[PDB]
């Protein structure tokens, strides 16, 4: 126990992402809110959710579905209230006050539709919280848009070998920047200052589930449930495995600490990963966790909010005190084995002649069984069983017949049943069997009736024959159970 | 040996003789002091057998007395009044008899002789059913004896004189009864499952001391007195063992997973526990000490009385007594004989015969790998159909059975032969006629016998079974017509010959352009052309062509072969239909969509039905009230809505099976085009013919499009196509319900055009 | 006699419920072989069944509605004759007349509520 649960939630429904998960005082007086900005149920009803404390107090409609929603800021001299960044399709929202104030939209290049698919911000000069952050973007059109903290010129075009489908981005604009775009085809992408190409590809072998930006390393998330931490080189250095699929991850931070490692939400409801020394990341949840921010909500510092696969929310503060089976063997062991020491030559003797009467026997009542056609398995390759469903007077009898050949057809065949017509009513008896295709089972149908006004059960044996001869192939029988019927 | 009663001296004691318990008796009624056991049987005849085995022989039998009336109880006590000797009391149903078994020596083992001497005698006013004797009170030196008539009531005889008796309160079969010395009371287990015990001076003085409410009623009753340091009363029941306490109590119960027959507590070995003696109706006895199983053995039969004795210098003697006549005296067997095959010599394999014989049969296994005439003969005239079966050979458990079609009917479908002896003619008679409104595919008609032939393996014979085909004429389902003139559908058979008059062809349908109206109302019109050689079929409907098309081939060939021609063919130039058969095919699997819909929507009101009945249910389980009128009237809303959903897919079932009959016709016709197209021989036909008619009706796993595509899939794959991507991707054979009929559709159009370039159909 | 007819009706109850649900299973099972006569019959027979114990229910529940107001008749019964004395006696007459209650020995109920 680590954890102080504010809220967990059960039956309200939200249904957000990590990226479009976003927390601010989109509005002033130093008390921070949990913008969401959530799809609905499915892709009916996105509604930008606004959270203060416990309950809901906003949900302002949108027009589609947000494939992010980013909080940045927008005054290095002063900063004022900072707005919230949503994206949907190629329109961008910038809401001040959490109210709808401007949109911008994507150049039009050749109507043709184009699509943003993740944001992300990078800082300016100084490197920390109080200085602007400049925007980042990739769309389904193969570009990448780093545009200026405020989104009012493009300030770099990139292109990208593929659809991006996960964005980070570290360093300042002017010095370096790298852009870690983690795309569909199974690959993460650096994008540095003054590419023509982007030159800087890495192979992970399927498509990330996300991705995390530690200091030094980056770390990806494989769909394929493992961790693996790269350097921004090129050179995989650690891997480690997850006992369940990775559904959603994030950037953890405490910097009180100096602890700062990777929140990845599992199937098996838990967040585990092994760091470097320490062992943490180490919570369980009543259901799986789809969407998770580690951040400053409310007042305190160290607020945990998520959201799960049935809806639900979960808010978790963390506290600032952060040889071998080898049998037994008893004594009838050793009085058999010297038993047997003594008198084997009469074991050996008895025993060879019991096996040569048991092959006789075996060899009679195989022939017996071809003499009367007995086998349902035994050129001419074919396999019938019956079996009955139903516990009233009325039984469906389906005789499952296979012809078991490498390629040819069984053309001529015909099933008899041999029934007791008293007991029994068969509608067809008589019927023929369809050209058996090689390697698939076909299954015929019918409907035996009890007609013993008692509990009177009886034989039915099913003949499998060609039409011209008059030698059943084969046969079947099926022991009709009680009639538990009137 | 482990865990046998090994024998001693036994004998079987009678011819179909009957023995009881009580019977059985063991002590020493001779009074030689010496403190041997001599066996006491009476029987239900009047046998008193006194025995002295000396281990049979004829020493052994002491005496073998036979008294008119039946033995009910034997007994062995001080039944005289001065004397202390003991002396033998013989109980039948209205007789009390004490004798005296006096025996005198004689020179030689051979001659010493034995007599019963009558030493008194009591009348019984009353049936008796058994007694018990004691020191009545606490007298000594006198076993005087209390005889429970079937009647309830306790008859007490002080020795030589009738004492008193008793009504026993409350009892209407009569019960076990034991007497306690330590407690002077009689004890009884009456019909209630009541074991009772009454005092014997409240007895005398006439009320029940105790009463303990067993579970069952009891067969035997045994007051062991062996041991004075705690008495305690043993209760055979007839499921449970039981030993209580003086004062009324249980001590301890066994439950008992057996039938008790009868049960003994003989002499204890620990301090304070009673070993006891238990014969099951499983011919078994069981030793245990308390209720702790120490011994189990098997006994020979099922014991009706077992004892205890020291015979011939040997004490502890088990001596059983069944009912059939089986005495017997035992020990227990305590040896745990190996377990070994026995090294026998003179006993070796006959390799030569057993050799011969599995030679035979490995002949008729590498052989594996590598009789009665049917006639269906059809009258000229609802036409009347005669079967003539005959056979060479004594056959039996013969079946005859017919099978028409859908619309057409029988009025006698199954005909049964036990038994006919050889080379002999059975002949049976039904009637067909048509049923419905739709014509049927075909105007065959099938029947099939099935017999066992006896052989040698198995008398029960071989099953065989053949059939015979015969063929309705066109006149059942058929009448002449007006010949319409211009119809939507049509076919054109062009033969190499003279066009035929068709007065000739179908003469009780009349004219040589002819009309036909079916049974149903369908109506096909046949015209000759004049000029060509060929003739046309039309009608508003693709599948009432076949039967005519059918009629107008085979009466063609008939016609051409009477007058003596030869060469005759039907090449049927043009293009085989295709448009007006697919139409058939959607509508089939129309029907069998909306077939499955039906049965998914059935599928959520019986789930939801199911729901509230469970709801009502639990309902019902509570004992208070509470309202639920809401509950049952949404549970007759969705029994109407069941209701109305099993009557709809009734519906579409009979329109399904409606549509399937009329889409086997149009797909005979497309096979007898294709076969005319193309000049199909018989084999090529016959496979067409299999694989394009599969089966009889559409059922909720195998349907008509399945088969028959994964057929046609095989034959493409197998016979017609080369590539390997096609017979890949494309030509797939599966049996699941598809989800539309476009991939049938194409396999069917590219199987006609692969047939027009070239190609032939195989097999392999 | 409350007490015996409710008996009664929970024993009838308990068979028809019994039977309901056996006809349910078989109902199924018609209905999974697409046996639609039989289904149907199942389905009438379901509905008679249940009119059938809906109205062994409606007398269950009257009677057992009566039997509550005659327990509760017998109770405060009890309590008015202990409320009758004041102290200690109270606690006496109201366990005598429940001890002559559980024995049904009215008589001595009524004797010790009148004196007692």
């Given at each position: ?16 992402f990590?990226a ?66 949503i ?12 109210k ?60 990208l ?30 994008l ?13 072998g399927?498509?990330?589930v996300?991705?995390?930006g ?19 080189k ?6 480690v495995?997850?006992?369940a ?6 950037l ?22 092994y ?19 580690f ?26 005190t ?13 009085d058999?084995?010297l ?16 096996l ?5 026997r ?37 005789l ?16 008899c ?14 019927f ?19 007609l ?11 003949l499998?024959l ?10 079947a029988?099926?022991?009709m ?6 | ?87 033998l ?20 083992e ?55 008796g ?13 007497y306690?010395?330590?407690?002077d009371?009689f ?17 005398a ?9 067993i ?12 041991i ?5 009363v ?12 003086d ?11 057996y ?14 526990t ?7 109706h499983?011919?078994?006895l ?16 099922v ?30 067997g ?33 052989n594996?790998?590598?009789d ?7 009258s ?24 028409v079609?859908?619309?057409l ?78 119809a ?21 349908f009349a ?32 599948e ?67 729901a ?6 639990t309902?019902?389980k ?17 029994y ?38 193309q ?10 013919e ?7 009706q559409?059922t ?17 794959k ?18 699941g ?28 | ?15 028809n419920?019994?039977?309901?649900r ?13 046996d ?8 009438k027979?379901?509905?008679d ?15 057992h509605?009566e ?50």
């Open positions: 126990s680590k954890w102080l649960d504010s809220l967990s939630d059960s039956m309200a429904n939200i249904h957000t990590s479009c998960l976003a927390l601010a005082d989109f509005h002033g007086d130093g008390e921070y809110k949990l913008a969401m900005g959530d799809l609905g149920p499915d892709g009916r009803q996105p509604r930008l959710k606004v959270l203060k404390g416990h309950t809901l107090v906003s949900q302002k409609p949108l027009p589609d579905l947000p494939a992010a929603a980013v909080t940045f800021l927008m005054a290095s001299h002063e900063p004022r209230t900072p707005a919230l960044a994206a949907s399709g190629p329109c961008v929202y910038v809401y001040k006050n959490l709808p104030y401007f949109k911008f939209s994507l150049p039009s290049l050749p109507r043709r539709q184009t699509v943003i698919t993740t944001m992300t911000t990078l800082k300016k000069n100084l490197a920390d919280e109080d200085a602007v952050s400049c925007l980042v973007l990739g769309t389904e059109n193969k570009e990448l848009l780093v545009l200026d903290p405020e989104a009012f010129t493009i300030l770099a075009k990139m292109s070998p593929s659809v991006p489908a996960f964005l980070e981005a570290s360093g300042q604009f002017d010095v370096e920047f790298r852009l870690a775009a983690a795309c569909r085809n199974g690959s993460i992408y650096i540095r200052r003054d590419s023509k190409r982007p030159k800087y590809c890495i192979e992970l399927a498509q990330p996300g991705l995390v530690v200091h030094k390393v980056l770390v990806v998330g494989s769909n394929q449930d493992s961790l693996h931490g790269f350097t921004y090129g050179k995989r250095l650690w891997t495995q997850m006992p699929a990775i559904l959603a991850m994030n953890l931070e405490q910097h009180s600490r100096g602890l700062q490692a990777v929140m990845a939400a599992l199937a098996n409801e838990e967040v585990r990963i760091h470097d020394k320490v062992l943490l990341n180490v919570i369980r949840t009543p259901e799986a966790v789809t969407s998770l921010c951040g400053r909500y409310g007042r305190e510092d160290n607020t945990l909010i998520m959201t799960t696969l049935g809806g639900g929310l979960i808010i978790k503060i963390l506290k600032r952060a040889k071998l089976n080898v049998p037994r063997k008893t004594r009838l062991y050793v058999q084995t038993r047997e020491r003594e008198a084997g030559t009469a074991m050996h003797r008895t025993f060879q002649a019991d040569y009467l048991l092959r006789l075996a060899a009679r009542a195989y022939v017996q069984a071809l003499e009367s056609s007995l086998s349902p398995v035994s050129r001419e390759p074919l396999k019938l069983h019956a079996v009955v469903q139903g516990l009233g007077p009325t039984f469906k009898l389906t499952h017949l296979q012809n078991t050949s490498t390629a040819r057809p069984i053309l001529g065949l015909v099933v049943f041999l029934y007791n017509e008293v007991l029994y009513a068969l509608p067809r008896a008589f023929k069997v369809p050209l058996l295709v090689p390697g698939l089972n076909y299954p015929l149908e019918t409907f035996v009736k009890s013993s006004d008692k509990g009177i059960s009886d034989i039915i044996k099913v499998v060609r039409e011209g001869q008059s030698t059943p192939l084969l046969s029988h099926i022991n159970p009680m009639s538990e019927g009137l | 040996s482990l865990f046998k009663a090994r024998d001693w001296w036994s004998t079987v004691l009678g011819d179909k003789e009957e023995f009881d318990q009580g019977c059985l008796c063991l002590a020493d009624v001779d009074n030689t002091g010496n403190g041997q056991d001599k066996i006491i049987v009476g029987s239900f005849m009047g046998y008193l057998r006194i025995f002295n085995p000396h281990p049979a022989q004829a020493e052994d039998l002491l005496l073998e007395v036979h008294l008119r009336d039946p033995i009910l109880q034997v007994e062995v006590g001080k039944f005289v009044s001065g004397t202390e000797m003991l002396h009391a013989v109980l039948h149903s209205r007789k009390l008899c004490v004798y005296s078994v006096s025996g005198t020596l004689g020179n030689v051979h001659g010493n002789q034995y007599q019963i001497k009558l030493m008194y005698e009591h009348n019984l006013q009353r049936t008796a059913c058994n007694m018990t004797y004691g020191s009545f009170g606490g007298v000594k030196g006198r076993d005087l004896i209390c005889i429970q008539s079937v009647d309830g009531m306790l008859m007490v005889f002080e020795q030589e004189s009738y004492a008193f008793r009504f026993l309160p409350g009892s209407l079969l009569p019960g076990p009864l034991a306690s010395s330590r407690t009371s004890i009884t287990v009456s019909s209630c499952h009541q074991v009772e015990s009454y005092k014997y001076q409240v007895l003085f006439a009320v029940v001391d105790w009463t303990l409410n579970g069952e009623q009891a067969i035997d009753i045994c007051i062991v007195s062996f004075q340091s705690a008495s305690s043993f209760v055979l029941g007839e499921r449970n063992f039981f030993c209580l306490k004062n009324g109590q249980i001590q301890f119960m066994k439950k008992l997973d039938s008790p027959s009868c049960f003994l507590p003989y002499c204890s070995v620990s301090e304070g009673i070993n006891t003696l238990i014969g099951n499983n011919n078994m069981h030793i245990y000490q308390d209720v702790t199983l120490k011994w189990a053995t098997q006994l020979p039969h014991p009706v009385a077992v004892r205890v004795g020291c015979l011939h210098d040997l004490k502890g003697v088990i001596v059983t007594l069944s009912d059939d006549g089986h005495l017997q005296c035992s020990y227990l305590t040896d745990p004989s190996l377990f070994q095959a026995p090294k026998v010599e003179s006993r070796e394999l006959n390799y030569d015969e057993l050799d011969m014989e599995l030679k035979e049969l490995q002949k008729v296994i590498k594996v790998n590598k009665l005439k049917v006639s269906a003969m059809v000229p005239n609802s036409v009347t159909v005669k079967v003539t079966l005959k056979n060479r050979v004594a056959l039996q458990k013969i079946k005859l059975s017919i099978y079609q859908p619309p009917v029988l009025t006698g479908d199954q005909f049964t032969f036990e038994f006919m002896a050889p080379e002999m003619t059975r002949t049976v008679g039904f009637s067909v006629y048509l049923k419905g409104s739709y014509s049927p595919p075909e105007l065959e008609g099938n029947a099939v016998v099935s017999y066992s032939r006896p052989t040698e393996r198995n008398p029960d014979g071989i099953p065989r079974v053949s059939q015979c085909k015969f063929r309705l004429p066109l006149k059942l389902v058929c009448l002449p017509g007006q010949p319409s003139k211009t939507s559908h049509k076919l054109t058979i062009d033969t190499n010959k003279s066009p035929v008059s068709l007065l000739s062809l179908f003469p009780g004219v040589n352009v002819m009309g036909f109206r079916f049974l149903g109302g369908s109506q096909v019109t046949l015209l000759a052309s004049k000029t060509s050689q060929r003739y046309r079929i039309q009608s508003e409907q693709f009432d062509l076949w039967l005519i098309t059918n009629e107008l081939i085979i009466r063609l060939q008939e016609y051409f072969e009477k007058q003596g021609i030869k060469d005759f063919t039907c090449s049927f130039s043009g293009s085989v239909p295709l448009e007006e058969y697919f139409e058939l095919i959607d509508h089939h699997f129309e029907l069998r969509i909306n077939g499955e819909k039906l049965e998914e929507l059935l599928s959520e009101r019986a789930v939801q039905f199911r509230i009945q469970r709801r009502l249910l309902r019902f509570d004992k208070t009230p509470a309202p639920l009128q809401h509950l049952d009237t949404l549970l007759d809303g969705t109407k809505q069941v209701i109305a959903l099993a009557d709809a897919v009734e519906e579409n079932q009979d329109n399904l099976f409606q549509s399937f009959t009329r889409l086997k016709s149009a797909t005979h016709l497309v096979i007898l085009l294709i076969g005319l197209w000049k199909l021989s018989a084999d090529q036909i016959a496979i067409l299999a694989a394009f008619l599969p089966l009889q559409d909720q796993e195998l349907g008509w499009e399945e088969t028959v595509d994964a057929a046609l899939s095989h034959l493409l197998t016979c017609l196509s080369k590539s390997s991507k096609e017979q890949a991707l494309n030509l797939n054979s599966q049996l319900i598809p989800k539309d009929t476009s991939q049938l559709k194409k396999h069917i159009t590219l199987f006609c055009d692969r047939l027009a370039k070239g190609g032939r159909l195989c097999l392999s | 006699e409350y007490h015996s007819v409710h008996q009664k009706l929970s024993a009838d109850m308990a068979d419920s019994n039977l309901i056996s006809l349910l299973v078989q109902a199924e099972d018609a209905r999974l072989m697409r639609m006569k039989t289904m149907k019959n199942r389905y027979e379901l509905y069944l249940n009119k059938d114990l809906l109205n062994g229910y409606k007398i269950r529940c009257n009677n509605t039997l509550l107001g005659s327990l509760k008749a017998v109770n405060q019964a009890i309590q008015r004759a202990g409320h009758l004395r004041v102290g200690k006696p109270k606690n006496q007459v109201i366990t005598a007349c429940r001890d002559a209650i559980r024995s049904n020995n009215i008589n001595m109920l009524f004797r010790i509520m009148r004196v007692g």
